[PDB]
Design an enzyme around this catalytic site. Structure first.
Site, mmCIF file in Angstrom:
data_model
loop_
_atom_site.group_PDB
_atom_site.id
_atom_site.type_symbol
_atom_site.label_atom_id
_atom_site.label_comp_id
_atom_site.label_asym_id
_atom_site.label_seq_id
_atom_site.Cartn_x
_atom_site.Cartn_y
_atom_site.Cartn_z
ATOM 1 N N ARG A 116 -0.107 9.117 1.405
ATOM 2 C CA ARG A 116 -0.849 9.115 2.658
ATOM 3 C C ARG A 116 -0.209 8.197 3.694
ATOM 4 O O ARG A 116 -0.492 8.352 4.886
ATOM 5 C CB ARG A 116 -2.313 8.714 2.418
ATOM 6 N N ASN A 117 0.676 7.279 3.281
ATOM 7 C CA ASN A 117 1.301 6.336 4.199
ATOM 8 C C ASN A 117 2.726 6.722 4.584
ATOM 9 O O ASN A 117 3.433 5.904 5.185
ATOM 10 C CB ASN A 117 1.274 4.920 3.609
ATOM 11 N N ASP A 130 2.822 2.171 7.302
ATOM 12 C CA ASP A 130 1.688 1.447 6.723
ATOM 13 C C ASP A 130 0.531 1.517 7.716
ATOM 14 O O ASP A 130 0.541 0.792 8.713
ATOM 15 C CB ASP A 130 2.054 0.006 6.402
ATOM 16 N N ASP A 142 0.824 -1.204 0.000
ATOM 17 C CA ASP A 142 0.000 0.000 0.000
ATOM 18 C C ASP A 142 0.865 1.265 0.000
ATOM 19 O O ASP A 142 0.620 2.218 0.738
ATOM 20 C CB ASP A 142 -0.963 -0.021 1.183
HETATM 21 C C1 LIG Z 1 1.179 3.545 16.007
HETATM 22 C C2 LIG Z 1 1.684 2.643 14.859
HETATM 23 C C3 LIG Z 1 1.399 1.263 14.860
HETATM 24 C C4 LIG Z 1 1.863 0.448 13.823
HETATM 25 C C5 LIG Z 1 2.580 1.021 12.761
HETATM 26 N N1 LIG Z 1 3.103 0.148 11.691
HETATM 27 C C6 LIG Z 1 3.617 0.569 10.399
HETATM 28 O O1 LIG Z 1 3.621 1.685 10.035
HETATM 29 C C7 LIG Z 1 4.180 -0.562 9.498
HETATM 30 C C8 LIG Z 1 5.146 -0.260 8.473
HETATM 31 C C9 LIG Z 1 5.659 -1.312 7.676
HETATM 32 C C10 LIG Z 1 5.247 -2.623 7.891
HETATM 33 C C11 LIG Z 1 5.832 -3.767 7.002
HETATM 34 N N2 LIG Z 1 4.915 -4.489 6.490
HETATM 35 C C12 LIG Z 1 5.452 -5.636 5.908
HETATM 36 C C13 LIG Z 1 4.490 -6.446 5.031
HETATM 37 N N3 LIG Z 1 3.512 -5.714 4.377
HETATM 38 C C14 LIG Z 1 2.572 -6.461 3.981
HETATM 39 C C15 LIG Z 1 2.978 -4.636 5.068
HETATM 40 C C16 LIG Z 1 4.063 -3.759 5.696
HETATM 41 C C17 LIG Z 1 4.295 -2.918 8.932
HETATM 42 C C18 LIG Z 1 3.777 -1.874 9.728
HETATM 43 C C19 LIG Z 1 2.873 2.402 12.768
HETATM 44 C C20 LIG Z 1 2.415 3.204 13.810
HETATM 45 N N4 LIG Z 1 2.705 4.644 13.810
HETATM 46 C C21 LIG Z 1 1.667 5.584 13.353
HETATM 47 N N5 LIG Z 1 0.525 5.155 12.943
HETATM 48 C C22 LIG Z 1 -0.420 6.019 12.528
HETATM 49 C C23 LIG Z 1 -0.153 7.399 12.568
HETATM 50 C C24 LIG Z 1 1.073 7.798 13.019
HETATM 51 C C25 LIG Z 1 1.465 9.242 13.139
HETATM 52 C C26 LIG Z 1 0.613 10.235 12.761
HETATM 53 C C27 LIG Z 1 1.036 11.543 12.933
HETATM 54 C C28 LIG Z 1 2.283 11.799 13.490
HETATM 55 N N6 LIG Z 1 3.070 10.828 13.854
HETATM 56 C C29 LIG Z 1 2.699 9.574 13.705
HETATM 57 N N7 LIG Z 1 1.943 6.875 13.406
#
Ligand SMILES: Cc1ccc(NC(=O)c2ccc(CN3CCN(C)CC3)cc2)cc1Nc1nccc(-c2cccnc2)n1
Ligand SMILES: Cc1ccc(NC(=O)c2ccc(CN3CCN(C)CC3)cc2)cc1Nc1nccc(-c2cccnc2)n1
Ligand SMILES: CC(=O)NC1=NN(c2ccc(Cl)c(Cl)c2)CC1
Ligand SMILES: CC(=O)NC1=NN(c2ccc(Cl)c(Cl)c2)CC1
Lengths: 257, 264
Positions: free
Chosen positions: A129-130, A143, A125
């Site tokens: 936006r991500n 993500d 994705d």
């Molecule tokens: C609170 C949280 C919980 C989980 C995650 N996870 C991810 O961001 C992420 C990134 C990459 C992967 C890797 N992954 C591997 C396989 N494929 C399928 C998907 C991706 C997984 C999760 C982020 C966050 N952080 C987050 N989330 C939403 C908003 C914000 C945010 C908003 C505003 C200011 N600062 C931070 N910050």
């Protein structure tokens, strides 16, 4: 494991950015008085937590801890002070966030993606936006989450539900277009129900106003019909670091004048 | 081994750059920094003489040496890679509303700044031309020297005084007495200026090489090209003074562009 922490260590403030990220809340990690981001909540949740302990890179959002023994569960990451990249670009000052900055942001994102390519991860994705913005135009990929964003989706994923690092390359090209337009929506005006057949017939978006030729050449390379004809993220990242260096030198020559 | 020596395995060799356009120059990757690089290979004294010269030249608008591999053959000279390629083809192919008058001014300014540096360090280029410049993102321009009289076929280089000359870039004192200097580089720069203003036309269009010397000695000079500003044309003419000592210095040329560029 090392990542487990007591839910008491965290003061849960209020839900992040008007809940547009779902059940993610601003939090304060009390022992450090550190503003953090907290995802709360089922086995997909633990899978995400498991994945985030395996990824570390300057341009990927950094996991700080988890709460996984009893409900409610926490995934805790750093807080990025400027929010998501799409809103940043849409509201930024374009004389500060200029072409050298735009190029810097694309370089950082291709860096994150090359790292996921190297560890054999798929994003699925990738989009403005991500992505998140910190100080000094730091960019980190994140993500947040039959429901596609069709306009970012590669032809073989629309048609065969096949996703790969190469369909992330396709989405990276669309993200470049988002950057070049300061966050317009792709395929302006085009019925998203006809996008697949338009792509199959070799329609692609034209070069946006102000976009450098080589950036657009990379977009078009990202949008090759066959996944195997698309560049790797290593090739994309190399092209951007090389451009970014040229742009940084030119920027200093200009300032010196 | 000196400080420029780098381990061969630091570089991924990819394929000939421009497919052989530049001879034994390959496109490569400096892996640890994810930078595309150019790599010149020996298919020997002259090879290492070039590397030694480039170790003394460090300037934003000159090609930058990154390292050399000289422990065993084949020998490598490694420089940066410039995304948009040589300036001549770039000018011929560019979108002119994007590459407009202010960008052309900016490119001429960068080239004059590199030559002012070579002048201050008492180097002579000897083959300054658009085909020997490189373009990068954000309108970066760097001066290079590809050794093109050896590689290029066509009428660009022709035999003369038991050598090969780009006749239409060559100062009179060099055509006549084979004398080269920073002031004959100043002559070539005036021609390069005309290449820029014409988006890469061949100089003296339609005039046979056999005529060029006689014309220049009888005070013929190229006309101001369409759209070229008069003060830029005035610099061209000053570059084409018959007596090398009446040509301006590169310090003066860069100052004139500096002044012009901030009034715009
Ligand atoms: C609170 C949280 C919980 C989980 C995650 N996870 C991810 O961001 C992420 C990134 C990459 C992967 C890797 N992954 C591997 C396989 N494929 C399928 C998907 C991706 C997984 C999760 C982020 C966050 N952080 C987050 N989330 C939403 C908003 C914000 C945010 C908003 C505003 C200011 N600062 C931070 N910050
Ligand atoms: C891989 C290499 C090895 C050596 C050189 N050397 C020079 O460019 C150079 C420049 C100035 C001098 C100064 N010198 C002093 C006096 N004499 C008389 C002449 C000049 C010497 C060498 C360049 C390169 N780089 C190079 N070569 C061919 C093509 C390309 C290239 C092509 C397309 C995109 N990016 C890069 N890049
Ligand atoms: C409105 C406008 O002029 N946008 C242009 N986009 N540029 C750009 C530079 C680098 C990258 Cl990577 C990208 Cl995607 C775009 C430069 C300016
Ligand atoms: C076809 C055409 O219009 N050419 C003109 N060249 N101009 C020019 C400006 C500054 C410099 Cl330094 C130079 Cl060499 C040329 C402006 C546009």
């Amino acid at each position: 494991d090392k990542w487990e922490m007591e839910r008491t260590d965290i003061t849960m403030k209020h839900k992040l950015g008007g809940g547009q990220y779902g059940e993610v809340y601003e939090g304060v990690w009390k022992k450090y008085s550190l503003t953090v981001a907290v995802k709360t909540l089922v086995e997909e949740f633990l899978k995400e937590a498991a994945v985030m302990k395996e990824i570390k890179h300057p341009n990927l959002v950094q996991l700080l801890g988890v709460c996984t023994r009893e409900p409610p569960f926490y995934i805790i990451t750093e807080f990025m002070t400027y929010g998501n990249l799409l809103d940043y670009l849409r509201e930024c000052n374009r004389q500060e966030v200029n072409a050298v900055v735009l190029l810097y942001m694309a370089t950082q994102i291709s860096s994150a993606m090359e790292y996921l390519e190297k560890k054999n991860f798929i994003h699925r994705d990738l989009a403005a936006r991500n992505c998140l913005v910190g100080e000094n135009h730091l960019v980190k990929v994140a993500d947040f989450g039959a429901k596609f964003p069709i306009k970012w989706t590669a032809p073989e994923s629309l048609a065969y539900n096949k996703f790969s690092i190469k369909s992330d390359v396709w989405a990276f090209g669309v993200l470049l277009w988002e950057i070049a337009t300061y966050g317009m929506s792709p395929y302006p005006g085009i019925d998203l129900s006809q996008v697949y057949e338009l792509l199959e017939k070799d329609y692609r978006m034209e070069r946006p106003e102000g976009c450098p030729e080589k950036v657009y050449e990379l977009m078009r390379a990202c949008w090759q019909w066959n996944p195997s004809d698309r560049p790797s993220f290593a090739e994309i990242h190399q092209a951007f670091e090389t451009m970014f260096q040229e742009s940084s030198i030119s920027d200093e020559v200009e300032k010196e004048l």
